[PDB]
Amino acid sequence: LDNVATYAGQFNQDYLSGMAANMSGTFGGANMPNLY
């Protein structure tokens, strides 16, 4: 059992007149670059 996760919750944003960025990202990892 092996887990990688992100939980982001409720954005309350009435009457918006500027700029907002709501960004959520998840990146698995057991990568292996090899150079022989």
Interface ranges with another protein (CB under 8 A): 18-19, 21, 23, 25, 27, 29, 31, 33, 35
Q: What's the min distance (Å) between Cβ of 12 and another protein? A: 20
Per-residue binding letters, 12-31, with a second copy (x by CB under 8 A): xxxxxxxxxxxxxxxxxxxx
Measured between alpha carbons, how far is 30 from 27 in angstroms, rounded to an integer? Answer: 10
Q: What's the min distance (Å) between Cβ of 21 and a second copy? A: 5
Q: Which tokens sit at 10?
A: 């409720």
End-to-end CA distance of the chain: 32
Q: What's the min distance (Å) between Cβ of 7 and a second copy? A: 5
> In this structure, what are the phi and psi dihedrals at residue 16, rounded to the nearest 5 degrees?
-80, 125
